[PDB]
Design a protein around this nucleic acid. Structure first.
Ligand SMILES: [Mg+2]
Ligand SMILES: [Mg+2]
Ligand SMILES: [Mg+2]
Ligand SMILES: [Mg+2]
Ligand SMILES: [Mg+2]
Ligand SMILES: [Mg+2]
Ligand SMILES: [Mg+2]
Ligand SMILES: [Mg+2]
Ligand SMILES: [Mg+2]
Ligand SMILES: [Mg+2]
Ligand SMILES: [Mg+2]
Ligand SMILES: [Mg+2]
Ligand SMILES: [Mg+2]
Ligand SMILES: [Mg+2]
Ligand SMILES: [Mg+2]
Ligand SMILES: [Mg+2]
Ligand SMILES: [Mg+2]
Ligand SMILES: [Mg+2]
Ligand SMILES: [Mg+2]
Ligand SMILES: [Mg+2]
Ligand SMILES: [Mg+2]
Ligand SMILES: [Mg+2]
Ligand SMILES: [Mg+2]
Ligand SMILES: [Mg+2]
Ligand SMILES: [Mg+2]
Ligand SMILES: [Mg+2]
Ligand SMILES: [Mg+2]
Ligand SMILES: [Mg+2]
Ligand SMILES: [Mg+2]
Ligand SMILES: [Mg+2]
Ligand SMILES: [Mg+2]
Ligand SMILES: [Mg+2]
Ligand SMILES: [Zn+2]
Lengths: 105, 146, 58, 159, 205, 61
RNA sequence: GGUUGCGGCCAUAUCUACCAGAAAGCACCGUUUCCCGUCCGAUCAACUGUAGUUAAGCUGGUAAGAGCCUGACCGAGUAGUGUAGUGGGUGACCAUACGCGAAACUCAGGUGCUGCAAUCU
RNA sequence: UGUCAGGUGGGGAGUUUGGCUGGGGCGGCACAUCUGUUAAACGAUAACGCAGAUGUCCUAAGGGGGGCUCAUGGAGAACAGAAAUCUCCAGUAGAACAAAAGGGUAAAAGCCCCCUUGAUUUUGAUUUUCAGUGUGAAUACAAACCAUGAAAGUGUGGCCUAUCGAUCCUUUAGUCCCUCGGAAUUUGAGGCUAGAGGUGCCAGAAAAGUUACCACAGGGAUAACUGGCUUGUGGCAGUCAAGCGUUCAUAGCGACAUUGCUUUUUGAUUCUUCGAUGUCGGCUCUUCCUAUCAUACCGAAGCAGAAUUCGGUAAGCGUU
RNA sequence: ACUAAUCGAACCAUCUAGUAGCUGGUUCCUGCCGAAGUUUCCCUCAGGAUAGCAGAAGCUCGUAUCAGUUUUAUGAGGUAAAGCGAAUGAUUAGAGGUUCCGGGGUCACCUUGACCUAUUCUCAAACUUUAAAUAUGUAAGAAGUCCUUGUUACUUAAUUGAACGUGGACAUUUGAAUGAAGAGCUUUUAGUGGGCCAUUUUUGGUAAGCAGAACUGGCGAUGCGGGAUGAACC
C-alpha cells in the first residue's frame, strides 16, 4: 500500500487542537532495553537449575503485521499513532498512481 | 388445540360448557374439532343440565346451586334471581351471558348410558364418528350423559 | 464415537413451562440512546417547569 | 464451513420489487416521525446505511428517538424464555408508519363523536366492536328464482 | 453393469438438473423425440392417442429410448412410417446419482430420468382414424418397457392441437386456420388489422 | 385425568405463622389474628402479616 | 380548458407508426464584446427577442397496435395446503371429513390523475 | 587443584508427542469465518450435505463535486479487412463497480476531470454472533476540527454482506501528570490513558517417535468374530419380443428395457457381546432345505434310432 | 535371559488413605413438588463452566401489566403450487425471411449451415413475472382522548414545533372474544448437559431396526385396558 509522507489531520497538542500539517513515518518497536522489570524478573527466574522456565512461542500463523504510522505535527512537534490494516508491502510516499499514462515502452 | 380447550374450560373427558356463537368462537370450535362433540342445545337439554349438574363458581369453589338464594347472591346484580333466570340467560343469549355462563362450573358429565352409538368415536360425526358439529343430535347425546 | 449435533427438541416446551414474559413496560422510560442535544435541553425544560409549579402552587 | 454473516440468507429479502428499482421517492423523506409513533420495518436494498438486520424485517415497533436522517425504534425480541427490548437506529427509507395505528386513531375519534352525540340522549350506543354475529332469519322468494340444478356430472376423460 | 431401475423408480429427491454445479453429466440415450411423419400437416392426422402415466415416478432415459423404439418399429412394420407422427413428451432432465464406510457418500452422475406425475402424458401419436388399433397396439407394446401403470387414452382433440375436433373444424371452415410447418396458427381477434389481412388473406369472406 | 392448567397442591408461599418460637410473639399473633378476623379494619390484617416476617423483612426504623 | 415553472404518485404515464395544434407560453432559432467552457459558441456561458419557424421538441388524437393497469360465478373452489381417522392401496400414492385457497389461461374495460403559483382568444 | 564462562554431551534424567471423524490410522478441516442453496415463504436449524470463497488488495480502488453513459448490434469514412482512428442510430444495463457468491446502482454507486485526507479527536448508545459476556464487523448520534460543493447536503475508510486476536511480557504515543514509603535534585525504574509486536487448535499449553516385551482404568459410547436390518454388488427367477435359429420371435436362445426372489458372496450399519459366546481349514457324525447331478414316473424338441437338450412331480435314496 | 516359584528394572518398609474426567457400591418409612440429554465457551467430544428445565424460602400486593387461543385492522415472507408463445439457464420440432467466414454448384443455383421473425415439446435445490396454506410482527385506550396555556440553553423566519407539564371535560359497553387456575417479583440450590421412538416436512444413501435436521406428541421417568407376545402404537 502507498501512504504519503505528509498529512493534514487533527493535532490535539493543546496548542493546535485543530487540523494541522503532519509528517508521516513508520513506527519501529525499539530496543528491548534490559532493566525492564519483566526482563529483570525473567533473568532471575531463568538462572540456576530448572531449564526453560517460561513458554517460547513457535506456532506462528500470520505472514504480515499491522502498519503503525507516527504522525508528527510540523509546528508543535507532537506525535500521534495510526494503525492501518494488514498489508504485505508498504511504501511511504512512493510514485503516486497515474491514470492518463500511455502504455508505450 | 389443548390451549383452546383450556380457554373453553374443558379440562377432562366428558366435560361440557356453553359457548356463545360468534365468529371469534367458531374458529376456536373449528380448531378443537377432533376432540369435542358439539351441537345446538334444546331448552329441555339446558334445563336438565342446570338442574341435575348445575354448580356455581363462588370464591373459586364449586358449589351446588340447589337454592335460588345461592344464584341471587352472585348473579342478582345482573338481574338473575332464580335457577330459571340463569337458564333463561343461557337459552336466550342475553346481555349477561358471559357472566352467567362463567358462573356455571364446567359440567361434569358421565359416559353415555346407551353408549356413543358408533364403533369408533374419533372420526367426524359426518364420517360415522363422534366429534364435530352434530347440531341437533347433541341433545340425544348429552341427555344420555346427564 | 459420534453423538447428536443439535436439536431444538424440547426447547419450546422448556421455554413455555415458565410462561414467556413481555418486557414489563413502564411509564417514563429510560432516556438511554436518546439524542444528547434533545436530552441536554430536556434537563433545562424540566427544571423550569418544576420552578413554574413551585412558584405558583408553593 | 458454516456461514452466519450479517446479511446471510437475505437474497430475496433485500431485493427490490420488479420494475421498482432505482431512487427512493420523496414521500419517504417528507414523512414526519415522532417519539411514540408505531412504525413497520422493511429494509430497502438500495440504501445500505442505517439498514436493519434481517430479523427486524417485518417487525413493528415504537419510535423512541428521532435523529437527523434516522429513527430509533423499540422492538421486543424473544430470546430463550422471555422477550428482550431491542433498539435499532434505522434510516427513514427502511421504515414507514404502520397503518394499523391510524385506523385505531380514527376509531377513538369516532368513539368520542358517538359518545358526545349520546351525551344529550340515547345512552348505551355500543362503543365496543362486536364479532360477526350469526345471521338472522329471513324470507327468500322464488319469484324469478325457482330452484333448478343438476346432479353430480359423470366422469369424462377431458383429454 | 447398470443398476436395476427399482433403485431410482420413485421421486425421492429434489429435481437435480444438469447445470453449472455438475458439469459432468452423461448424455440421455433418447435424442430423437419426434418420429414418423413429423412434417405432416394438422389436417392429415386428426386422431390423437395418448400413453398416459398413472403414477408419480421416474422413467429413465434408457426406458424412454427402449419404449420409443418398440412403439415406432411396430407402427412402421404394420402401417408404414409415414402414417403417424410420434411425439414423446417427457424429457429426462433429472440426473440420477450413484455412490460407489458412508463417509463422503455424495454420488457421481449415473444417468438421466424423466420425472412424471399422475396423468402426465408420456407418448403422443397423431394419426388417421383408420389405424387407431395400430397405434393403440404400438403404445400397448411400449408399456412393457416402463415401470408403473400406464393407460392408453384416446384424445378428444384434433391431433396435437389444444382444440376439440368439432372446434378445429368450425375454425378451419373459416379462414381462422392457416397451415404452418408442422403445427398450425390460429386467428386472433386482437392485433393490427394490417397484420390480420396479410396473414389469413383467405379470411374476410 | 385432568388437563391441569396450574401446579397442583401448591402452598401459598406466604407465612401463615412466625417461624420464631418466641412465646410472647405467638401471643401477639394470637391477639391480632382475632382482631383481623373480628374487625374489618385493614390495619389489623397488615399488622398480623408483619408479625410473621423474618428479620431481614423488618429492618430497623 | 390550453401553457409555463416547481412537484406528488411513478407506464392507465412507456414504445412504434401517422396525423392535427388559434392565442399565449415553451421551443428551435439569430450573435460572440464581456464572465465562461471547448479540437469545434455542437454542448456549456453570455447578448439581443431582434432577422425567421411550428419543421422538430412539446401537447393531444388515431391503432380489432405491443406493453401496462383494473375487474370478472374466465379458468377454479382446480393445483396446493392446515387438521383427522385401527381410511383405501404391496407400494408409488390416492380418496373422504372440518377449513384456507392460488398462478397461468380466457374475456371485458381503460391508456394518466392531481397539488401550488403564474399566464392565455 | 578450586570457582566462573563457552562448546560438546540419548551416555544418562524428566517430560511431551492436538481435536473432529459412520472404529482407529491415512486423507481432509466440516477447528475462526464469508456467499448461495439444503432450510420446510418470521427467526433459528444438522451431516466429512451441495457449489464456492477468506488470512489479501487499495493515497485511491477513501471523501466531496462537476461533466458524461455502459455491454452489444447496425450503418458509414485512404491503406484497414471479422479489426487498429473518426461519425451517427438503437441500446433497462444484456456492462462496470479489487478479489467468491448474492443483493444494490444510469443527469449513478459505472467512466473522465477538479479539489482533497472524515482512513482525524473525545466519549457513551445501538445491531449481529450472544451468556444478551468478549473479539471482529457495522449503525445512528453528541462535542470538536476539517474536506468538498454555488448550496442544500455529504464524508468517523472501501456500495452492502468476510477479510481477524486476551492475560503476562516488551515497545511506542499522550499527560509532562502520580510513586520510588527518612528529605531533596538529576539519571534510572515503576504507574495511568491509547496503540503495536500473537497465539490460524483462531476465548489464545512451550512439545518427536516407537513398542510384535508391554501395563493400568475402562469402553460393547468403538473396530476385528457369530447373530439382527438392507441387498447396491454376488447369485437365482420372471415379463415384453427387435432379432438368431436355412425359412420360423417364443424347439432352443434372445437385444433394448423392466418386475422380482435369496441371504451360502462382498459391501453398508454398529443393535448385542470388551468382569472374554475359544477367531481358519480339515477329520468325524447327524439332521434339514431345493434353486434336481444321478435314480423313479412323465411332458416338449430343429425327439428316425442311439445320444442329447428343455420342462414337471419329486429331497425317498445316493453323490466317490 | 537370569538376578531365591518375583524381571522390558528384584524384594522389603515408608512417603501413601499417592491421583483417577474411569468401574463398582453408597443402609428407615410416608407425604408434596418434580426434570434433562439442549444454548455458548473450554487441549473441548466418557469432563466441566454457563443459560435453560426443577425444588425450597418466600416477599409486595389482591383480580390486575396477562394468555403455547380466536376475531378485527394493518404489516412482513418468496416455500407448495404455477411460468417458460415473460428475464437467466436448459430443451424438441418444423415454418417464413435474410447474407456475411457459411452449401461443390452464378463466373445465381428443388437437393442451404448459422442469424432474425412468428410458432411448438419439455424442465430448474443453488431460475423467475406471480404466489398460497400453515406459521409470524403490531394494535384494539385513564401511561387514553380533546380544549386552554407554562418551561427550555433544543428547534423555528417567527412559541413555529419538540418533549414534559398546570388547569378543565369524559366512567362501567372504558372502547373485540374466551379464560384467568391468584398476579407480579426476588434469592438460593439439586439433578441434567450419552438420548431414543411415532405422524408430517426433509438431507446423504440402492437401502437399512442406517446416518442427519424442522414442528409436535411420546418413551426415557409410566403403571392400567387393548394390539397373543413388544419402551414408544391405539
Ligand atoms: Mg547458570
Ligand atoms: Mg347398558
Ligand atoms: Mg368402540
Ligand atoms: Mg452430546
Ligand atoms: Mg450466507
Ligand atoms: Mg460503509
Ligand atoms: Mg435423497
Ligand atoms: Mg434433495
Ligand atoms: Mg449557438
Ligand atoms: Mg530419554
Ligand atoms: Mg428462513
Ligand atoms: Mg468506490
Ligand atoms: Mg526508602
Ligand atoms: Mg483451541
Ligand atoms: Mg477455541
Ligand atoms: Mg494448563
Ligand atoms: Mg446407532
Ligand atoms: Mg466362557
Ligand atoms: Mg423344484
Ligand atoms: Mg530397579
Ligand atoms: Mg480413599
Ligand atoms: Mg491407593
Ligand atoms: Mg405432579
Ligand atoms: Mg421451577
Ligand atoms: Mg426460501
Ligand atoms: Mg415448485
Ligand atoms: Mg425453487
Ligand atoms: Mg454424561
Ligand atoms: Mg436413563
Ligand atoms: Mg400382533
Ligand atoms: Mg400391551
Ligand atoms: Mg390418534
Ligand atoms: Zn500540533
Amino acid at each position: 500500500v502507498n501512504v504519503p509522507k505528509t498529512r493534514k489531520t487533527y493535532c490535539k497538542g493543546k496548542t493546535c487542537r485543530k487540523h494541522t500539517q503532519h509528517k508521516v513515518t513508520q513506527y519501529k518497536a525499539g530496543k528491548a532495553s534490559l532493566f525492564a522489570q519483566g526482563k529483570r524478573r525473567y533473568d532471575r527466574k531463568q538462572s540456576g537449575f530448572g531449564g526453560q522456565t517460561k513458554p517460547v512461542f513457535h506456532k506462528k500463523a500470520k505472514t504480515t503485521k499491522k502498519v503503525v504510522l507516527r504522525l508528527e505535527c510540523v509546528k508543535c512537534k507532537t506525535r500521534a499513532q495510526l494503525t492501518l490494516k494488514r498489508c504485505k508491502h508498504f511504501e511511504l510516499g512512493g510514485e503516486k498512481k497515474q491514470k492518463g499514462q500511455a502504455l508505450q515502452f | 388445540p389443548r390451549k383452546v380447550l383450556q380457554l373453553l374450560r374443558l379440562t377432562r373427558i366428558n366435560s361440557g360448557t356453553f359457548v356463545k356463537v360468534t365468529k371469534a368462537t367458531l374458529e376456536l370450535l373449528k380448531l378443537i374439532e377432533p376432540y369435542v362433540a358439539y351441537g345446538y342445545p334444546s331448552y329441555s337439554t339446558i334445563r336438565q343440565l342446570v338442574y341435575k349438574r348445575g354448580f356455581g363458581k363462588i370464591n373459586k369453589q364449586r358449589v351446588p346451586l340447589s337454592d335460588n338464594a345461592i344464584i341471587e347472591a352472585n348473579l342478582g346484580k345482573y338481574g338473575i334471581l332464580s335457577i330459571d333466570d340463569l337458564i333463561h340467560e343461557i337459552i336466550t343469549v342475553g346481555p349477561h351471558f358471559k357472566q352467567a355462563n362463567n358462573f356455571l362450573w364446567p359440567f361434569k358429565l358421565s359416559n353415555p348410558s346407551g353408549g356413543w352409538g358408533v364403533p369408533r368415536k374419533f372420526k367426524h360425526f359426518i364420517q360415522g364418528g363422534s366429534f364435530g358439529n352434530r347440531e341437533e343430535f347433541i341433545n340425544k347425546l348429552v341427555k344420555s350423559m346427564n | 464415537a459420534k453423538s447428536k449435533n443439535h436439536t431444538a427438541h424440547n426447547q419450546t416446551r422448556k421455554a413455555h413451562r415458565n410462561g414467556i414474559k413481555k418486557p414489563k413496560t413502564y411509564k417514563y422510560p429510560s432516556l438511554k440512546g436518546v439524542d444528547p442535544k434533545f436530552r441536554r435541553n430536556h434537563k433545562h425544560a424540566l427544571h423550569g417547569t418544576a420552578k413554574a409549579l413551585a412558584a405558583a402552587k408553593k | 464451513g458454516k456461514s452466519h454473516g450479517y446479511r446471510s440468507r437475505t437474497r430475496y429479502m433485500f431485493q427490490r420489487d420488479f420494475r421498482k428499482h432505482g431512487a427512493v421517492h420523496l414521500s419517504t423523506y417528507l414523512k414526519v416521525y415522532k417519539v411514540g409513533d408505531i412504525v413497520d420495518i422493511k429494509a430497502n436494498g438500495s440504501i445500505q446505511k442505517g439498514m436493519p438486520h434481517k430479523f427486524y424485517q417485518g417487525k413493528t415497533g415504537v419510535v423512541y428517538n428521532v435523529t437527523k436522517s434516522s429513527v430509533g425504534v423499540i422492538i421486543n425480541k424473544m430470546v430463550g424464555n422471555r422477550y428482550l427490548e431491542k433498539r435499532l437506529n434505522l434510516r427513514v427509507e427502511h421504515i414507514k408508519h404502520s397503518k394499523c395505528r391510524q385506523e385505531f386513531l380514527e376509531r377513538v375519534k369516532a368513539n368520542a363523536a358517538k359518545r358526545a352525540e349520546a351525551k344529550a340522549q340515547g345512552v348505551a350506543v355500543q362503543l365496543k366492536r362486536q364479532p360477526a354475529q350469526p345471521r338472522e332469519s329471513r324470507i327468500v322468494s322464488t319469484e324469478g328464482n325457482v330452484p333448478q340444478t343438476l346432479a353430480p356430472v359423470p366422469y369424462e376423460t377431458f383429454i | 453393469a447398470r443398476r436395476p431401475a427399482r433403485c431410482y423408480r420413485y421421486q425421492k429427491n429434489k429435481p437435480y438438473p444438469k447445470s453449472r454445479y455438475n458439469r459432468a453429466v452423461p448424455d440421455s440415450k433418447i435424442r430423437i423425440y419426434d418420429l414418423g411423419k413429423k412434417k405432416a400437416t394438422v389436417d392429415e392426422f386428426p386422431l390423437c392417442v395418448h400413453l398416459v402415466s398413472n403414477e408419480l415416478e421416474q422413467l429413465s432415459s434408457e426406458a424412454l429410448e427402449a419404449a420409443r423404439i418398440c412403439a415406432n418399429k411396430y407402427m412402421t412394420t404394420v402401417s408404414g412410417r409415414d402414417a403417424f407422427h410420434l411425439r414423446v413428451r417427457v424429457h429426462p432432465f433429472h440426473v440420477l446419482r450413484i455412490n460407489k464406510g458412508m463417509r463422503g457418500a455424495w454420488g457421481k452422475p449415473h444417468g438421466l430420468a424423466a420425472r412424471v406425475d399422475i396423468g402426465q402424458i408420456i407418448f403422443s401419436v397423431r394419426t388417421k382414424d383408420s389405424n387407431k388399433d395400430v397405434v393403440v397396439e404400438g403404445l400397448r407394446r411400449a408399456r412393457y418397457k416402463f415401470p408403473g401403470q400406464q393407460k392408453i387414452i384416446l384424445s378428444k382433440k384434433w391431433g396435437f392441437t389444444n382444440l376439440d375436433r368439432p372446434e378445429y373444424l368450425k375454425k378451419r371452415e373459416a379462414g381462422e386456420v392457416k397451415d404452418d410447418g408442422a403445427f398450425v396458427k390460429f386467428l386472433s381477434k386482437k392485433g393490427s388489422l394490417e397484420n390480420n389481412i396479410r396473414e389469413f388473406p383467405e379470411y374476410f369472406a | 385425568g385432568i388437563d391441569h392448567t396450574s401446579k397442583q397442591h401448591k402452598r401459598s408461599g406466604h407465612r401463615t405463622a412466625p417461624k420464631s418460637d418466641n412465646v410472647y410473639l405467638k401471643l401477639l399473633v394470637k391477639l391480632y389474628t382475632f382482631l383481623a378476623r373480628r374487625t374489618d379494619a385493614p390495619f389489623n390484617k397488615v399488622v398480623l402479616k408483619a408479625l410473621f416476617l423474618s428479620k431481614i423483612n423488618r429492618p430497623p426504623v
